[PDB]
Amino acid sequence: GSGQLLFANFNQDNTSLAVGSKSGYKFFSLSSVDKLEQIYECTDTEDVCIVERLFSSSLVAIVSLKAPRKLKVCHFKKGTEICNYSYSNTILAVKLNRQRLIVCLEESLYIHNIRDMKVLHTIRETPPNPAGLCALSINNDNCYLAYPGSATIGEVQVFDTINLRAANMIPAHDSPLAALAFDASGTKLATASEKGTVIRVFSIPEGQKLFEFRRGVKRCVSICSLAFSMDGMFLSASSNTETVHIFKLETRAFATVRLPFCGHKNICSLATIQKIPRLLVGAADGYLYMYNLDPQEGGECALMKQHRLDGSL
């Protein structure tokens, strides 16, 4: 069942691609565009539906469909389970950084100390979040969690996970939130709503609007993935359509790409590989698509490579 995929995501600095499947999970290096080098495979746990690495360390958090309320934290190179924790409901998302691990359930969020896996704080009776929409800053210094503060209005709760206290709620959109992403610094948050007309960027924790990008004329769209380049200069927005928009944070999309496959959610990231900025798109057809961004002039980006997410050649 290595070809029956359940999950794909990038690690915090876009150096690793993780893919979960019925047979287990795999990691791939993103140091080259010409090959997608497998660096690890584990089949000890089947039906892997969440797999989250900590940068390029050996720590991985895993969830299986066979036990969907159970989080396993492992040392993947030693092949050992370090600990596990079971929750009252299905785990919808797991996020981590070097200080904290967050588990999102439909009506609660658990904030763990990643140094000892103790629960430091639980956010209870949240607006129901069956999609598991949330974001966690990857930065060592600005350690914020963002999640929906209403299920009917696009309010963002911003929570400091070191001090264990809220920042200001951001009334980001009238309609409900569809996507959230922090930049690599943790000092900016990108948001989009179900309406999908604009992508907004707010300062964190002050909540001041810094940028507003017209995705385009208003239309039926579900924005699914927002991603910043590591230097914060570019922001990509993808959806269930074929167009990925790349915006440039300066003062019409700066660049666009047309995917060969659409109709479903995808995941994107902006990563510099071999000195060229790239857009990476993981799609529901089982491919990773790799495009080159021209950071000076933008425009239509060329497809350079596609690779099978299941590791096939």
């Binding site: 050996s58 370090i82 600990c83 000892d116």
Partner: peptide, 23 residues
């Protein structure tokens, strides 16, 4: 039983720190 819980927690702390080491 509590001294042993502290022993298991010390082991967990050590193992989490080791796994989080980055090259």
């Amino acid at each position: 039983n509590e001294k042993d819980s502290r022993r298991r927690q010390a082991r967990l702390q050590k193992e989490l720190a080791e796994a989080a080491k980055e090259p």
